[PDB]
Amino acid sequence: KQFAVIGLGKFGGSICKELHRMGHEVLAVDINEEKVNAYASYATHAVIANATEENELLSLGIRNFEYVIVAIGANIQASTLTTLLLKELDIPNIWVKAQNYYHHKVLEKIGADRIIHPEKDMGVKIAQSLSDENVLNYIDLSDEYSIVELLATRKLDSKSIIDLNVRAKYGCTILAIKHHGDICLSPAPEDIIREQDCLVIMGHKKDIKRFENEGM
Amino acid sequence: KQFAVIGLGKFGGSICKELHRMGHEVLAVDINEEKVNAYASYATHAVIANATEENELLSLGIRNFEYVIVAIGANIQASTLTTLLLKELDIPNIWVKAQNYYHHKVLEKIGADRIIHPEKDMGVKIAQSLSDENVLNYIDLSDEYSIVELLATRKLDSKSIIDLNVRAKYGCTILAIKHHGDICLSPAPEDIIREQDCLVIMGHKKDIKRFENEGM
Amino acid sequence: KQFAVIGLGKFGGSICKELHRMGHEVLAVDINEEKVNAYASYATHAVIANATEENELLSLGIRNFEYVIVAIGANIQASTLTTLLLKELDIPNIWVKAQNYYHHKVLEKIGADRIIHPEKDMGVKIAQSLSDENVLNYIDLSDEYSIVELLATRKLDSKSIIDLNVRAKYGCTILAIKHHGDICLSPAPEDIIREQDCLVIMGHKKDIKRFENEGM
Amino acid sequence: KQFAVIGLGKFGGSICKELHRMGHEVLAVDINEEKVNAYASYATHAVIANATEENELLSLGIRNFEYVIVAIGANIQASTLTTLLLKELDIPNIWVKAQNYYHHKVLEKIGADRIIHPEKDMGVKIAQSLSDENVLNYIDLSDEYSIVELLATRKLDSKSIIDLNVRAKYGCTILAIKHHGDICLSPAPEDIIREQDCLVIMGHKKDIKRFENEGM
Amino acid sequence: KQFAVIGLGKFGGSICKELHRMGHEVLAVDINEEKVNAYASYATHAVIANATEENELLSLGIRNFEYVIVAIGANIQASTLTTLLLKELDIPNIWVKAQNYYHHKVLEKIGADRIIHPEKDMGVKIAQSLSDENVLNYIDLSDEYSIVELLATRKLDSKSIIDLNVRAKYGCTILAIKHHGDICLSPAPEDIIREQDCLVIMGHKKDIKRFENEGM
Amino acid sequence: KQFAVIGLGKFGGSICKELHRMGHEVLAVDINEEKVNAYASYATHAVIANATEENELLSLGIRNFEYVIVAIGANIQASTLTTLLLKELDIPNIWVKAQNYYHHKVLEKIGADRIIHPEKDMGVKIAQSLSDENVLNYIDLSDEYSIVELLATRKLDSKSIIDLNVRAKYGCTILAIKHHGDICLSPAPEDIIREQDCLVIMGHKKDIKRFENEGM
Amino acid sequence: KQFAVIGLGKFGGSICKELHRMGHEVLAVDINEEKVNAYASYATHAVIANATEENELLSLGIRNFEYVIVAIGANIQASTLTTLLLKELDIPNIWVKAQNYYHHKVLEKIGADRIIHPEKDMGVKIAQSLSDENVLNYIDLSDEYSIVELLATRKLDSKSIIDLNVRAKYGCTILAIKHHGDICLSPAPEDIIREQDCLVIMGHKKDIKRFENEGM
Amino acid sequence: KQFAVIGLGKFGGSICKELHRMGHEVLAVDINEEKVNAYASYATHAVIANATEENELLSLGIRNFEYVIVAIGANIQASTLTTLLLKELDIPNIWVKAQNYYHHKVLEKIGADRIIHPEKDMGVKIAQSLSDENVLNYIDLSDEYSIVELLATRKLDSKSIIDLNVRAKYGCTILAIKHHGDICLSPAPEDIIREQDCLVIMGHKKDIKRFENEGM
Numbered sequence A, B, C, D, E, F, G, H: 001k002q003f004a005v006i007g008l009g010k011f012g013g014s015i016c017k018e019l020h021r022m023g024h025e026v027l028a029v030d031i032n033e034e035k036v037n038a039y040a041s042y043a044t045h046a047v048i049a050n051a052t053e054e055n056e057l058l059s060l061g062i063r064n065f066e067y068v069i070v071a072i073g074a075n076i077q078a079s080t081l082t083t084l085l086l087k088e089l090d091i092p093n094i095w096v097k098a099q100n101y102y103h104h105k106v107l108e109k110i111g112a113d114r115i116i117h118p119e120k121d122m123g124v125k126i127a128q129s130l131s132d133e134n135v136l137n138y139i140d141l142s143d144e145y146s147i148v149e150l151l152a153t154r155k156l157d158s159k160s161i162i163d164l165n166v167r168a169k170y171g172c173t174i175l176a177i178k179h180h181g182d183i184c185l186s187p188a189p190e191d192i193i194r195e196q197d198c199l200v201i202m203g204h205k206k207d208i209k210r211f212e213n214e215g216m
């Protein structure tokens, strides 16, 4: 699979650097010479180009790539024009970073395959950790059920899983325990939990919160 | 708990709006009048203020708040100065959005309690989804272990959980199956999977990938 | 013919006000109540509406109009999305005011029927009037030929058309003379020109300038 | 004569670029470095300066220029303040772009020599072209008479000038024909008109419209 | 009747402080924080604000005040812009301190209701007292007539009013005599004057000087 | 008598220029060459000098002058230092313009003969005219008595002096009437007052105000 | 001896705090309540007072003190007035901190006993340490001779005093050596110097620099 | 070595003026026009610039300088912000003036190479001179030993260095005698001391003091 990342900023650069680490063919494209030089090490190839210019875009051989990521930030107009050009060149997947609701809409209309709101999405998750000091990370299975990574409190120190009757008191199941960085999966009822451990609980959203209120 | 969100941008605004939805006391603060007006519905109070001015911060009554979030983006100097002011006002928790590695370092030195990289973090997650079309979402328990939400292919159509002997062959456990919106938790070995369903697997990262290559 | 003018600014407002004077059915649409109130007198109907909202657009019954003018200025995003929305509603003629070179390109791509650059076009005309203080107004037939309205000097005072033999000496023709508001068309060779009158000459651009240098 | 253009916007930039093309000495002045860089090619000299600052204006040697154009747009205060300085320096001709009616009035009081409303003026012209799509361009001789450039229709295809007897039937005269970019001035009665040609007719406004309705 | 004093300097501060002493509603406005704190005691309300900024001016509720005094001194640009805003906001009475002759001209054109030259006026008044040691204070009724307060000399000691026939000999009338703090109004012909008393004479300027030269 | 004016500002300049009209020997002194050039016409002699420099002070022959006025403004130290220098040179009369209360105190201590507060004094007078729109000008004889110049209103239109019996009803006396610039002194009881005339009344401060409320 | 320190700033406060450590009677005086509160522990007495007010000055009984230090900083007017007042009370020693050249001059004239320029003096010393990284501290005996504390380099490691014969070669004498905190005074010719030790040399300024360039 | 001094105040200016005197390359930088103008004579180059602005700082070519001294006056934010930029530009040596204990801490954290307290340090030294009337200046070798410059009293008049048996009695050494400005270094036992001469003694602090008590 070949990847082209247009706009080597905070978002696009991270994508480029991460994709490269996984051992993928990644083309980094940026209008700023300094940006291109920086990511020369972190890309298969890095090229200075203006994505709004079709001739420059064609010069890259951009038609070859199955995934092209438009991560241009502050010039929303440049972002729009680029997406329009890429769609004209029949790029299979065009993923674009959006700046606002209106920008999301025009991208949606002009045929962006995937639209991303990095700041907006993270804002939600960080807010979850703000409201609940206990939650470290989570993943939602549905509207009602979820898997949550919790930070163990002192109330859970030296408690066993069978001691913490979570399937019966709360209808939830404990999936993992992380102790001093070492992790345990599908932990047995005899396993003990100590403070500052990572605890992975799975169940109904309301049920988990009750475990947090009463249990920890 | 009272929360103050300074800088109502894409990141800060989402935090504020989400915190407000959960029914928390949130103070929205921004130097731009237009930004403050927009989030008026989504905050307990919304105030036009310069966070770099010590006198203005006191007018807000910022000492009252347990959590103050500095989500100023493009002006690194204001972000730094604001963070610097808040520590002098002895704010318990100061969370700040960072723009680069160097900005992260100065925040760390001047006593920021939490430093966040929304664009950087999302870049990684999206890169994982770019490289592997099968993964919809994931959460990392540690460097080696993770919980992954997968999109079932036709190679997995009408296969049983005991058929996909994941607990022994790959050392991973399946946590959930989502079929037509209907959700199944901790599914039994007799349960069936149909294509384009969501599959939630838990285990070591390499083990999951092996399941992806060989199984699906 | 029905006309809809979206965005009651300097440009759009002038369009609406002038069209109304000619006795056309003109629908004035603006997001600002004050703007709508201002043009209540100068339109057939005036409505407060957000043009980026499809449901509001349908409430206007905008599909009926043969010409829709998008004159939103500072919000390039709204202009693009509105233009984009109007095309999906199959509006016959969509005229849009452009803010920059890139805005021009997206409008061209998303199917704007006519794109207008009011400032750029006036800049050209005013520059011509700057170099030649004598020219009041003009119209270009081509790159080389033009029709120009001139302000008569004392050098042309009490001069006859046959006296200023421009048809042979300069290969130019005098089309009209305006005296004290009274107008004369295709004036006879015996007709006199007085200073501070309006003089309309037609010919080659270089040839006209020769008349200005030598004649007046 | 030397020209100075303050404010390199859509209007000011166009003025400067066009004046430069005519081979005049034009000084491009703008407070934004990016604007100055852009018009460096299109000006004799380009300088970064704040026009509201008397010392910076003197550094330019602005007293030398016969014409100074203030094309600052969104900052009415800077536009006003700059204009005020120029009159103090006894600048011969001060032409200023106005943003609103009140701005027009203050400019008039403080001694602006010419006041321009680019958007407002174009609004009228575009409205004329909206009502009549046949007219390409025009110039008004008076309230009642005008010279109009028309887009020839099929009703005029392969028609001769003597065939379309406008001089007697409509009291109008045909001044020019533009065919294949090639231009014909004061055409003889035998000359033919083909569709999609430019036709320049002269007469009373009502009479021309009658020619448009009946003739084409 | 509400008063707003913009610019708390030597002049404006005195106005505000004196207006306050009479028990009027006075709003003290200054851009400097240090100035505002000082006149908090001597004003009904004192606010830190930039008077050139329309949004800050409206926050003051400046539309409410019948009289607004612009006493900004050294920044002629600020004085002008502030004055311009106030006329634009339709403030009934705008009194402005002028710095020079030209500043007087721009203020008059932009609609200042009263223009004051405190230093200029006092210079004249003090100069009169420099040239003539006898005059303590005076007031001009016209270009030619005045009322003057004189310091009685030894030549006037123990002189009666009927002795000094200023009413017939000099065409002037003595209005008052002030002796040891005790005051005499419209003194009778029998009343006596002693040296170093305050003497208030009324008449023509030339006639008073003749009384000073011949009489005193 | 010879006069030296040090510091040719708004205050000092006015003194010098006014003194010059009266035909006095005036030395204009200023550190700024441009100020000196301006007042060359308005002074007996004009010299560039630093008043804080003792050697320069002696070169002027400042010892010759009976009155030296220090009207330096923004550098309070220079004002103090010059005044301090002049007193050690035993200058007969040293008049100094003061910037604030503390500056008044040091000048008083170090032997300034007269201290002037031009802005402060005018502030008071202007405030009186602000509070009372009727008063044009005034002079105080004591704490309780004053002479006031009034602007006649319509309530005083076509009124005689005997009609407005202020001598008995208000215990005040009318001194003068000014009509269309024409002036009348010590007017007879038959004389009439019309609105927009100047009226000069003399009496107790409280009494005059009573006349203003009830009479006009 | 009793000391009075007026103005508890960086300068005055340090004086006050250090004098107290030596066990002297120190009166701390400041107009700011917070300043007085801060130095309550570090003074014999701490009093809130305005030093410019004579009645308050008498209330302190400041006439009793042999030394009064005026360390008021930002208000040059207060510093002058206070210093001026103290001389009226015939205070034996009045030491005052000066803000500029003019402030020094007036203080000199009004009888300040000692005038100090802390920033200016340190500015000189820091510049010496800036030019020469080797010098740690120094004291000037005159314009030409000095005693300097140096940081030993590797070039001086294990060198004897007789080895570095500075008394004849450079005309300088070594006064002391500091090794690992242990101190040696007037060291014998056999004593050794090691790097990173403190070295005290005495001689001509230029000669010492020659020793630094060639010797170390 | 090249030096840049930001903030031309009492401290920074003294540094700049002194470094320039030594014949060093010194860049004087200040936002105030007079300050830059004032030290123009005393610096290699002087530029008006805001040090908190990276672009203005880069225009200076600040990267060239080995030493940058931040003497911004009282805006701890400006001092902090400037210091922050210089560390980001990898400036070799960053010396900063601190305003308080807290300003010292932030400077320490953000990587100031040297932090200076001019007023505070001088306060200590001056306090030493206050307590001991004899000491003119001193330098501390350690907590217990010092080199001291004394002002000779009448008790030391016409005393010889063998007469003052300081060599044995007080364990102190006389290093220099300064007579009428002429200096004697390492003076011989026959040399005499006269009153009001400068005397440089070296030894233990308490022992030096006893010599002051008994000897002078």
Ligand SMILES: Nc1ncnc2c1ncn2[C@@H]1O[C@H](COP(=O)(O)OP(=O)(O)O)[C@@H](O)[C@H]1O
Pocket (backbone or CB within 6 Å): A006, A007, A008, A009, A010, A011, A012, A029, A030, A031, A032, A035, A049, A050, A051, A052, A071, A072, A073, A074, A075, A078, B119
């Ligand atoms: N026309 C263009 N062509 C190519 N790259 C561009 C163009 N315009 C901007 N960029 C690049 O996009 C990046 C801007 O991203 P940025 O504003 O940092 O957003 P974020 O930080 O959220 O990724 C910059 O690296 C810039 O070089």
Ligand SMILES: Nc1ncnc2c1ncn2[C@@H]1O[C@H](COP(=O)(O)OP(=O)(O)O)[C@@H](O)[C@H]1O
Pocket (backbone or CB within 6 Å): A119, B006, B007, B008, B009, B010, B011, B012, B029, B030, B031, B032, B035, B049, B050, B051, B052, B071, B072, B073, B074, B075, B078
């Ligand atoms: N000194 C300040 N005080 C308060 N708010 C500020 C200050 N400086 C900037 N801001 C606000 O912070 C916001 C930054 O948002 P933005 O950078 O767009 O977030 P993101 O980078 O996540 O999109 C801006 O809307 C701006 O108005």
Ligand SMILES: Nc1ncnc2c1ncn2[C@@H]1O[C@H](COP(=O)(O)OP(=O)(O)O)[C@@H](O)[C@H]1O
Pocket (backbone or CB within 6 Å): C006, C007, C008, C009, C010, C011, C012, C013, C029, C030, C031, C032, C035, C049, C050, C051, C052, C071, C072, C073, C074, C075, C078, C097, D119
């Ligand atoms: N979403 C929207 N829907 C309709 N009208 C809008 C919308 N957004 C802005 N406008 C209107 O467009 C106008 C823009 O005019 P302006 O840019 O000031 O003048 P011009 O563009 O003619 O130079 C504004 O008056 C505003 O009310």
Ligand SMILES: Nc1ncnc2c1ncn2[C@@H]1O[C@H](COP(=O)(O)OP(=O)(O)O)[C@@H](O)[C@H]1O
Pocket (backbone or CB within 6 Å): C119, D006, D007, D008, D009, D010, D011, D012, D029, D030, D031, D032, D035, D049, D050, D051, D052, D071, D072, D073, D074, D075, D078
């Ligand atoms: N104080 C100032 N001095 C000089 N140029 C200025 C000043 N303020 C604004 N400008 C310039 O005026 C220009 C305004 O252009 P713009 O408003 O975009 O075009 P238009 O007026 O046609 O809409 C900007 O390029 C800006 O740099």
Ligand SMILES: Nc1ncnc2c1ncn2[C@@H]1O[C@H](COP(=O)(O)OP(=O)(O)O)[C@@H](O)[C@H]1O
Pocket (backbone or CB within 6 Å): E006, E007, E008, E009, E010, E011, E012, E029, E030, E031, E032, E035, E049, E050, E051, E052, E071, E072, E073, E074, E075, E078, F119
């Ligand atoms: N934009 C502004 N808004 C409000 N006040 C201002 C503004 N600019 C200046 N000022 C104030 O105006 C005052 C000018 O006073 P000054 O020059 O001392 O006049 P005077 O000579 O009469 O004392 C200053 O105190 C300043 O704070």
Ligand SMILES: Nc1ncnc2c1ncn2[C@@H]1O[C@H](COP(=O)(O)OP(=O)(O)O)[C@@H](O)[C@H]1O
Pocket (backbone or CB within 6 Å): E119, F006, F007, F008, F009, F010, F011, F012, F013, F029, F030, F031, F032, F035, F049, F050, F051, F052, F071, F072, F073, F074, F075, F078
């Ligand atoms: N040391 C000095 N010697 C002589 N004249 C000076 C000195 N310092 C300033 N001046 C002059 O004194 C005048 C000060 O007046 P200014 O500051 O305008 O106050 P104002 O306008 O209220 O009189 C200026 O013209 C200045 O050039």
Ligand SMILES: Nc1ncnc2c1ncn2[C@@H]1O[C@H](COP(=O)(O)OP(=O)(O)O)[C@@H](O)[C@H]1O
Pocket (backbone or CB within 6 Å): G006, G007, G008, G009, G010, G011, G012, G029, G030, G031, G032, G035, G049, G050, G051, G052, G071, G072, G073, G074, G075, G078, H119
């Ligand atoms: N009129 C006054 N009477 C007494 N103390 C004063 C007066 N004015 C100022 N001060 C004090 O003098 C101090 C000045 O110190 P500051 O200027 O902050 O630092 P520095 O001592 O370096 O100049 C202030 O702390 C203030 O409290």
Ligand SMILES: Nc1ncnc2c1ncn2[C@@H]1O[C@H](COP(=O)(O)OP(=O)(O)O)[C@@H](O)[C@H]1O
Pocket (backbone or CB within 6 Å): G119, H006, H007, H008, H009, H010, H011, H012, H013, H029, H030, H031, H032, H035, H049, H050, H051, H052, H071, H072, H073, H074, H075, H078, H097
């Ligand atoms: N951003 C800046 N860039 C350059 N110089 C500055 C800046 N901000 C302030 N300054 C200058 O720093 C100088 C130092 O102020 P001051 O209080 O005199 O300090 P000090 O007397 O201790 O040196 C001031 O003269 C001021 O003009």
